[PDB]
Amino acid sequence: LSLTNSSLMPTLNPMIQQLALAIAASWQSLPLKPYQLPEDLGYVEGRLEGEKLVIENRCYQTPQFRKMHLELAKVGKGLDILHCVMFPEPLYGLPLFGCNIVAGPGGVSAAIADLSPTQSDRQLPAAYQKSLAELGQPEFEQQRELPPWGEIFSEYCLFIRPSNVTEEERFVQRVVDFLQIHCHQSIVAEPLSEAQTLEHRQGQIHYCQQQQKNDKTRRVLEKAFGEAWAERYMSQVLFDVIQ
Numbered sequence: 001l002s003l004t005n006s007s008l009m010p011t012l013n014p015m016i017q018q019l020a021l022a023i024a025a026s027w028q029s030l031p032l033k034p035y036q037l038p039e040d041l042g043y044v045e046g047r048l049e050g051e052k053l054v055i056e057n058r059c060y061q062t063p064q065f066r067k068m069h070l071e072l073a074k075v076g077k078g079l080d081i082l083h084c085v086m087f088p089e090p091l092y093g094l095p096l097f098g099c100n101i102v103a104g105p106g107g108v109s110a111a112i113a114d115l116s117p118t119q120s121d122r123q124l125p126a127a128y129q130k131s132l133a134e135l136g137q138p139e140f141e142q143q144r145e146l147p148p149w150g151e152i153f154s155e156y157c158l159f160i161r162p163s164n165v166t167e168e169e170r171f172v173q174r175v176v177d178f179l180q181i182h183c184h185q186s187i188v189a190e191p192l193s194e195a196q197t198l199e200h201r202q203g204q205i206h207y208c209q210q211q212q213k214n215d216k217t218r219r220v221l222e223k224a225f226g227e228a229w230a231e232r233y234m235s236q237v238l239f240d241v242i243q
């Protein structure tokens, strides 16, 4: 988890480096246990007719978080990617923390982060709404509109092309704030009823089914590994549907 053993870290975009470190720092003192990904995946690389894709995976769990997945990736020399989801244990009804940063030699092209709902009413729990509203509306110059499958994201979702260093840092600090709120709520969360647990499970299943519609992610995987490998990776590794 220190990321000192990461082969990719030294070479990734600096915003991706700071976010990876912030996430790792948020997790470091938790009652972590390993989470074995399919085939006990760690590092993986592939190439077909174009550029190589290299991926590093770290994954944990705690009693509140079913699966805590931090992934770093690079395609050839251009394209750097950070992907992170904290999948909640439905028993506790926490939202889904998620982040995706994509960067090229021209800087960060996409920075996305959210705490996504799992309630059937599509709202975050009241304590989250309150804490998030207190952060205030962050100003970013270059907002990006979510695709239709993006209905899963909350009203606090960030999706921008950072314009400059000030904005990169403002985005990273907002992610730190989201992680601080989320880790705090995890300690105050009580186990829920069977009907509420079920309702939260359904929201997490929906979230994964929608995230699988991301053709931008799927194309990157397909270009290095092929269609069948990409379908397995998106459905079993990135956005597994619980059951």
Ligand SMILES: C=CC1=C(C)/C(=C/c2[nH]c(/C=C3N=C(/C=C4\NC(=O)C(C)=C4C=C)C(C)=C\3CCC(=O)O)c(CCC(=O)O)c2C)NC1=O
Binding pocket: 071, 073, 081, 082, 083, 084, 085, 097, 098, 099, 100, 102, 109, 110, 112, 113, 114, 146, 147, 150, 159, 214, 216, 217, 218, 220, 221
């Ligand atoms: C191997 C992993 C992995 C890869 C290969 C990947 C690729 C990837 N995701 C993208 C966008 C995107 N990614 C997301 C969102 C997310 N994606 C997530 O994995 C999570 C957790 C969220 C949100 C919290 C969204 C909303 C877009 C834009 C999709 C579109 O523009 O149609 C893009 C286009 C970036 C851009 O337009 O500037 C690429 C190349 N993302 C990854 O995670």
